[PDB]
Each structure stands twice: as C-alpha cells, then as structure tokens.
Design a protein around this ligand. Structure first.
Ligand SMILES: COc1ccc(CCNC(=O)[C@H](N)CC[C@H](CNCc2ccccc2)C[C@H]2O[C@@H](n3cnc4c(N)ncnc43)[C@H](O)[C@@H]2O)cc1
Ligand SMILES: COc1ccc(CCNC(=O)[C@H](N)CC[C@H](CNCc2ccccc2)C[C@H]2O[C@@H](n3cnc4c(N)ncnc43)[C@H](O)[C@@H]2O)cc1
Lengths: 330, 337
C-alpha cells in the first residue's frame, strides 16, 4: 500500500511542483556546491530522482539513488534521458536492504512528514548513516519541532458536535449513547491538519531539536518533548499547535525550510492536538508538560500530551492518533 | 488497513448519517415487515449494527450480525445497551470464516461500492448465501449497473494539462520529457469520481443486471458488459459514464436505492472512464463494444473498455484501474454542453 502509492507519477508530480520544497532543496544543494563537488552522495527515497539531479548539477562524482517503489524504473528513464548514466546510479530497494559499493560523503533526502516525524521515514534516513564516511554530512542536517498553545473555541465545538452524534438516545429508534465516551475519545485523538492565524497562539513556541548527524534510528521510537510556556494572553487553551523547520547546514551557508505559520503555507500545513477539556490560563502563568511520541506498527506514532497550568494545578492528559488525522483545510 | 479503517466510529457515523443509505434501508425493511417478522436474519458487515436493529424493529426472531473489524466490539455494546441480546447475536469475524448455528430466511447488507462492484464486498454478500434457506431472500435483491457515452471536452483536456507537467526540458534544470507518455497513461487509467449534467450523455443508457438471488460469488471475478449505444446527439465521445441502482424486492413492495445522475447526489457520485482516443459519432450512429471488469488483488477491478463507431470503424481501446480513482468533485454546478 505504502510503496504502491509512491509508484504513481501523480504523487511525485505533486511533491515536485511544490516550489518552496523543490526550490529550497535546490538552493541548499547548489549554494553549498563544495559539499557535493567530486563527492559521493546517497539519495534516500529518491522518487523521480530530482534531488540526485541537484547533486549532479553541483558536481557530485557519483550519486547512489535508492528508491523502494516502482518509481525507481521512472528515475532510471530520467537518468538516461538526461545523459547522467555515469554519475547517477539508481539502486532499486529499501535503504535498509540494498547493497552500496562504497561509503558516501553526504546523504540527502526529503523524509519529513506531518509534525516532522509522521510516516517514520526519518528512521530510514538515520539507518542510512551506516554508509556515511566519518567526515560526512546530511541534508537536512537538523530538524526543529515547534509547539505552542492555541485558543480556538470554534474548532473545539466542531469536533465536539461530531462526537455528540453518539449521544443520541434514539437514532432511527436506536440508542447510541453507550458509545458517547468512546466517540468523544476517538474524535479528540484526531490531530487536526490545517493552518490558522498566528494570533490564536497564546505563548512563544518551544523548540525541540533533532540533530540527524547525532541521532540513532532507535531514538525515534520514543521521543519525549518537554515544554514550559510563558502565557502571553489570558483565556482557554484548546490544545497545542505543532510545526517544524529543517536546516541544511552546509560548508558555505545554512539554508532553512520552514513550515511555520508565519511563513507561506506549505503542504505540511500545521498540526493541532486538541484537549478534550480546554484549560484556562492567565497571562503570566506557566503551562508545563511533556509530548511523548511512541512509535507504532502503522508507520506512525501514539502521542501522549500532558499539560498543566502550574499556578492552579489545572491538568489536561491527552492522546493523539497520528494514523487518523482530520484534514480540515478548505 | 481495510478493517482498521472500519474500526473508527467516525467512519461508521459517516455512513449512518447518510440518509439515502440509512433511511432507504429502514423503509425497505419496515415496509416489508412480513419478510422479517419471526424470521432468522444474517447481517453481513453490520458495522455499528444499524441494519440489525432495523430487522429487530420489524420483528425478527434472531439476527446474526457479522462484522470483521473491531467495530464488532462497539456493536456488542449497542446490542446490550438496547436490551436486544436475546435477538441480535454479534459474531466477530469474516462472513467467510465464521459459523452460524442455523440457516437464515433473509440476508441483509450494504455491500455497494463505486460502479456497484468496487471494494469487492458483493463477493462476501454472495458467499453468505451458503447460510440462506432454499427459498430465502436477499436485501438488496438485484443491482443494475447503467452505462452511457458522454462528451466532456474540458475533463478530457485536463488529463493533458496535468500530464504536460512532465513535458518540460528544464524543470529546475532537469529534462522531465521522457516520462510524459507514462504520465498521460497513468491519468487516463484513473476512473473519475464526480457528478455531471445529464445533457452531456449522448445516448440512452444500457443496463447490466446482477440478480443476487441467482448470482454466484465467482460471477463477480469477471464481469462482461456488452453495449450497443444508439447515438441521440452528434459529437466527440470522450468515454463512458457509470452509475447503479439496487432494489429491495420484498413480499409487500419493492424499494429502490438509485445513484443515477437524474436523482439527488449520493456519496457514490457517478464514475466516468475516459477514452484516451475519443470517437466522433453522429446522431443515429451506433457505438458498440465491451466493458470487461476483471477482479484484482486490491479489492478492486482492472477495467477494459473497447468501443467502436460501427458506421466509420473508428475504435478506442482503454484500460483503467479502479484502485486509483480520481476524486474530482468540488461542488460547483455541472455544465451542459
Ligand atoms: C496529493 O499528492 C500527494 C503526494 C505525495 C504525498 C506524500 C508526501 N510525503 C512526503 O512528502 C515525504 N517527505 C516523503 C517524500 C519522499 C520523496 N522525496 C522526493 C523529493 C525531494 C525533494 C523535492 C521533491 C521530491 C518519498 C519517497 O521515499 C521513498 N522511500 C521511503 N522510504 C524508503 C526506504 N526505506 N527506502 C527507499 N525508498 C524509500 C518512497 O517510495 C517515495 O518514493 C501525499 C500527497
Ligand atoms: C468519508 O467516510 C467514509 C466512510 C466509509 C467509507 C467506505 C464506504 N464503503 C461502503 O459504503 C460499502 N458499502 C461497505 C459498507 C459496510 C457497512 N454498511 C453499514 C451500513 C448499512 C446500512 C446503512 C448504514 C451503514 C462495511 C462494513 O462491512 C464490513 N465487512 C466487509 N467485508 C466483510 C466480511 N467479509 N465479513 C465481515 N464484515 C465485513 C467492514 O468491516 C465494515 O464495517 C468511505 C469513506
């Protein structure tokens, strides 16, 4: 199912024609061309091969382009039609299972999902470091997850209205209300994928940094993000908002790709995790807690968010089912 | 993944709050109460159990409600809550793998997908007739697939607008043009899910009927639908449009559920299969051929459509995969020619 989806040219097209994504990667690579010139490159999950082409433009001597879907066949076609057979070598397969003939100077990939970690492709990216030379680099080099409390009564009421379907004592004569609790729980486990006005954010964001040069694959099985927010506005906190930046830390310059709500909307949007019960906080209070992401079998995460207003002891404990997001953007 | 999807209350709710589903089924069952009163019922893929509750409202003695996803746990909670444990038995599992303690008088289900057959659940519905008494009934009893040729130049030219992304010699310095043919082929292989104005239809529909009381499970592995269309309008034929009706043929009356474009829009919409090579036909011409649906491993079908204009010999041959439909519906009022 997963690699079947990526076998479609339409999905590769959709990612490629996203200019912030494609254009930022090309700038990161070309403006750091000394990190590529005459070097050996591994492209993890190359799709059409676009990043491998950028590495070749920047003067890479040899690029191993690993792709697990049938899109590998299409990448091979483009390498031949662009006369790059001596420079880009497609290796069909999962990066965990293929054989490479030598170690590489730099690994490149676009492994980011919703909230950075969704899809769990960063595990494959970090796995690939078995091929990285000791002096070696990775593009992207780091990822910063940002979280901030938000207020959005409308979104809270939207989701509660849907759940309240299961409150009905006589839906076509049938009592559904035994499932009231189960339904509220399920709906509030859905992360909400869309954008929002920055004025709904009630505190400055807290940053959690993953350094891909240092992180191990296994580390992403359990991700613990501590936070302490200094509330800038009084009101109800309906949940936490999440976004991410990645940096390409090259030898010439650092280039950033941001999905922040202060930046042009991207196809990652932003993600919000709702509280079943909103918390009241006053400006000046502190909202503290821990976001715990636990990896599961569906290439996703079970998220635990516990947040408390320190001054009052008002606490919210919450689950998020990242397998089952609500795509709200209209 | 398939049964995991159905374990969400939100998904089941989406189908329950669809009134053309839930309302039509309730009417079909309650208006045919003599088909259910003191009878034994099998509910195939019951989800929340809603149809089983309707069978009980109609006075069924015993309902075996079979559900393969974890929604069966929630159905059990509802059966208890509604004090019907003596009359509805929730059996967790696939209808192909469970055991019933007796044969049943009637089987009820909502197994319809896009173009009727998508999702392949009708095979489970027909499989369940191993439990049906000799003269038992099935609700739905019959399904009618309708097909008609259409003209839609704008839909046709969208496929090339999208594919021609690849016809660029320097997309960020890369020549993409070698993949344009593959892209065209992929887009044309996607059946288009959306609605349309009936005035784009160029001939009266042809109807293919499956009688679920007589059909066998294997009949649905290879479905051959011949057609001969007598053109009412002159123009370019860009493909075939598909929709379906099912009938609940009770002892008291027949109730229809229709997804036709002459009827209020449903969540099945309609489905259009484009010809990558469109056919010129004039009013009075005959457009003949064959739509072959070949079951595949992804709970879907490979679709082969071959059509020719008899008077000119002009021919169009097309392969689609119903596992990769394009959901085109936006909401904007459909345009006539
Ligand atoms: C509506 O249209 C849609 C289109 C696409 C999507 C999914 C979007 N997902 C992402 O953006 C993720 N970041 C993954 C991106 C990369 C491809 N990156 C290529 C790229 C880079 C820069 C600019 C443009 C494009 C996936 C490839 O990774 C492959 N892959 C994943 N895991 C592995 C693995 N372990 N080994 C090998 N290949 C793998 C997978 O088959 C693929 O082909 C959703 C909707
Ligand atoms: C955006 O929201 C969405 C929500 C749902 C969908 C999928 C739509 N599919 C259909 O409508 C198909 N007709 C299948 C409907 C039936 C349920 N019918 C319940 C009903 C009946 C009348 C009125 C309202 C509701 C599926 C159950 O069938 C189960 N099932 C499928 N195959 C089997 C099987 N072999 N054995 C047992 N259960 C099975 C499956 O687990 C399920 O729970 C897509 C999008």
């Amino acid at each position: 199912q997963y690699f079947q989806f990526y076998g479609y040219l339409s999905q590769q097209q959709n990612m490629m024609q996203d200019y912030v994504r494609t254009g930022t990667y090309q700038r990161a690579i070309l403006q750091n061309h000394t990190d590529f010139k005459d070097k050996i490159v591994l492209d993890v999950g190359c799709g059409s091969g676009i990043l491998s082409f950028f590495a070749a433009q920047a003067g890479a001597r040899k690029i191993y382009a690993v792709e697990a879907s049938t899109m590998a066949q299409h990448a091979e076609v483009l390498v031949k039609s662009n006369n790059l057979t001596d420079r880009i070598v497609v290796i069909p397969g999962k990066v965990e299972e293929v054989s490479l003939p030598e170690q590489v100077d730099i690994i490149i990939s676009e492994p980011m999902g919703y909230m950075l970690f969704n899809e769990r492709m960063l595990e494959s990216y970090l796995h690939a470091k078995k091929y990285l030379k000791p002096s070696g680099n990775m593009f992207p080099t780091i990822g910063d997850v940002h979280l901030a409390p938000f207020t959005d009564e409308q979104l809270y009421m939207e989701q509660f209205t849907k759940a309240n379907f299961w409150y009905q004592p006589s839906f076509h004569g049938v009592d559904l209300s035994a499932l009231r609790g189960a339904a509220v729980d399920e709906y509030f486990r859905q992360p909400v994928v869309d954008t929002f006005d920055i004025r709904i954010l009630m505190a400055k964001s807290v940053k959690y940094t993953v350094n891909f040069l240092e992180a191990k694959e296994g580390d992403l099985h359990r991700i613990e993000i501590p936070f302490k927010f200094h509330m800038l506005h009084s009101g109800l906190v309906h949940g936490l908002a999440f976004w991410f930046d990645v940096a390409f830390i090259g030898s010439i310059m650092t280039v950033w790709l941001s999905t922040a709500p202060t930046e042009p909307l991207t196809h990652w949007y932003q993600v919000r995790c709702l509280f079943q019960s909103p918390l009241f906080a006053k400006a000046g209070d502190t909202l503290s807690g821990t976001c715990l992401l636990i990896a599961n079998k569906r290439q996703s995460y079970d998220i635990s968010i516990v947040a408390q207003v320190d001054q009052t002891g008002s606490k919210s404990s919450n689950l998020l089912d990242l397998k089952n997001p609500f795509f709200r953007y209209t």
